[PDB]
Design a protein around this ligand. Structure first.
Ligand code: HEM
Ligand code: NO2
Length: 184
């Protein structure tokens, strides 16, 4: 289970974060051992559609080739803290698994600027017992983490050396599909 109440960035700029552009995961930290594969790749687009906060997700397993997309409408708990009911979709937005109660993740933006972010997520999916996941994001694919986000990791009392890099994995990202999904 998840154990952290992540604190959102003071003065979080929602319009800047939810601007329709893509965020690449470059490093991640799962608090529960063996909760995720050690080699993995993910990206998301966050935006607004008709005034609703939306996220489109992309997961790619560089070994198995398992690939999946999701779309969510986000509900606001407080500035920078959201609850998201996801539907699994193909890259075109065609629904493969409908929204269902108990299938949701929380999402907290702990730090963000024009190029980088640190987020916490807690995934709830059916009978899965998942744990806390932190991710360092960048606007640029596979970019090395800058001093601002690394300092934010420290300020959150996390050790960045413990994070697992995704930058060296053979991963491709369909950024065009992610952006287009924001309306799905
Ligand atoms: C490198 C970072 C990440 C890794 C390694 C990772 C890993 C995984 C894995 C292994 C699964 C499949 C679990 C299963 O069904 O057995 C999964 C599903 C999922 N993850 Fe992530 N994830 C990452 C980033 C994220 C982020 C940033 C979010 C939210 C913004 C997210 C949200 C979800 C959701 C909603 C599902 C279920 C999707 C569905 O079943 O339709 N993940 N993730
Ligand atoms: O491990 N996906 O939150």
């Amino acid at each position: 289970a998840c154990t952290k109440n992540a604190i959102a960035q003071t003065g979080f700029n929602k319009d800047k974060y939810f601007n329709g552009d893509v965020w690449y995961v470059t490093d991640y930290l799962d608090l529960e051992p063996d909760d995720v594969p050690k080699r993995y790749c993910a990206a998301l687009a966050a935006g607004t559609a008709s005034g609703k906060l939306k996220e489109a997700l992309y997961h790619y397993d560089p070994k198995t080739q398992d690939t999946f997309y999701d779309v969510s409408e986000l509900q606001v708990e407080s500035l920078g803290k959201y609850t998201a009911n996801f539907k699994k979709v193909d890259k075109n937005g065609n629904v493969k698994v409908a929204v269902t109660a108990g299938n949701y993740y929380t999402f907290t933006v702990m730090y963000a600027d024009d190029s980088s972010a640190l987020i916490h997520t807690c995934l709830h999916k059916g009978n899965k017992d998942r744990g806390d996941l932190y991710a360092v994001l960048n606007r640029n694919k596979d970019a090395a983490a800058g001093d601002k986000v690394k300092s934010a990791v420290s300020a959150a009392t996390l050790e960045f050396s413990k994070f697992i890099s995704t930058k060296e994995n053979n991963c491709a990202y369909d950024n065009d599909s992610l952006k287009s999904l924001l309306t799905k």
